[PDB]
Amino acid sequence: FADEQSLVGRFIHLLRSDDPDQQYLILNTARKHFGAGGNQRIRFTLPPLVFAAYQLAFRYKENSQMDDKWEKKCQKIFSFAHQTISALIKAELAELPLRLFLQGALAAGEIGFENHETVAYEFMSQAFSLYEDEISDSKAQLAAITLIIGTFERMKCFSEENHEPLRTQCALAASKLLKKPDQGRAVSTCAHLFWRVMECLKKALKIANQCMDPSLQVQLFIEILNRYIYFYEKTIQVLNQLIQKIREDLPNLESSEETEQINKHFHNTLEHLRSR
């Protein structure tokens, strides 16, 4: 149960062991009397057991110097973890086991055990299993995939011949955001996922020529005027003539509570974009 899950946190804590395997066999006693709990009890106990197995893999990463099997015992965790994540895939949970897989991507990533990232790419595929075809809600689509983009911002661990297919497949998954401001904000960060580039912002410009809310695409233009700063400075004409377009469009919109604050944005962005 839920209070049991907090006490599973106590079972993580008062019933850990510095030997990770003695913790693991009692994690298997936590599989015995407690991981044989049900479908909602194992919804309650197993992700902390996975968080235990996270920490057990981190205890194996704390056994990086005193143990030699700890990478394989991170993997002896990992497959057992993955099936325990799959034991929640069997337990009608796919949305939350994304995140544990997303952590299992990073648990493969941050530890770097043997064959970690292909299974994490399989976890990326498992993320693309557990995200890309079950979420029809656009908000739960967005905050998943943008965090997935946010983790793919942190997934530079993939080499440049393995980075691009998920880099397209998230941009594939960024297309499923049924509203274009959900798309383009992901798409703008998809342009940030490359590090060509600026055309994806012209795609985001084209996304901003597809939006229904006219100040919001100008807020997206503001975001474009935010986004035309970064990989520029890290494309040599657009800013002040579009600052002229904010001398243009921010007049020819609502002079509203957002947009006069966006005037107060723009005036203070005039304080910003006067880089002086």
Binding site: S6, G150, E153, R154, Q219
Partner: protein, 182 residues
């Protein structure tokens, strides 16, 4: 107004609670307004702060069980106008002009952040921006050596004073940097 801000409690999803020096230093009743950025994951994590004060306001994180939290909400008491956000929609975390330009979009002065689990705060473009970190010591991908620290702050009139208590290891390192609101 002595107000205590926090964030990323992760109860009980990453770590448990505040250290014993912290709940010692954070007694109930002393706080006027309580702002929690996100990652409370439960209900008693609100009631633990509801023992501390009556003005407790939380917006939605990403690990949250609650769906009732609005994302952004402008609040103001006295001479200061604050918004509260958790920080998971910040892609990535640490741009210099992102927080200077998100502030003027809604015309606020003082911003409180989270989800990055790392203490970092300074003054930039007539505004002061605050990232306390992880209060219960939860893990971030960017920071492995997680140091929990709490921040109690004071507003009297258009000039703030802060008291960050760095628990680097086991000892309280009190730091303080002035700021005056224009």
């Amino acid at each position: 107004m002595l107000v205590l801000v926090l964030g990323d409690l992760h109860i009980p999803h990453r770590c448990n609670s505040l250290p014993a020096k912290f709940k010692k230093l954070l007694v109930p009743g002393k706080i006027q307004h309580i702002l929690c950025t996100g990652n409370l994951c439960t209900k008693e994590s609100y009631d633990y702060l509801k023992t501390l004060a009556g003005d407790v306001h939380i917006v939605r994180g990403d690990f949250d069980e609650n769906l009732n939290y609005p994302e952004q909400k402008v609040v103001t008491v006295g001479q200061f106008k604050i918004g509260l956000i958790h920080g998971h929609q910040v892609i990535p975390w640490g741009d210099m002009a992102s927080l200077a330009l998100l502030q003027r979009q809604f015309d606020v002065d003082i911003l409180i952040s989270g989800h990055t689990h790392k203490f970092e705060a300074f003054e930039h473009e007539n505004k002061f921006y605050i990232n306390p970190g992880s209060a219960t010591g939860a893990y971030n991908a960017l920071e492995t050596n997680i140091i929990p620290s709490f921040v109690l702050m004071d507003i009297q009139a258009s000039t703030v004073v802060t008291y960050v208590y760095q628990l680097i290891g086991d000892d309280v390192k009190v730091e303080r940097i002035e700021y005056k609101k224009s």
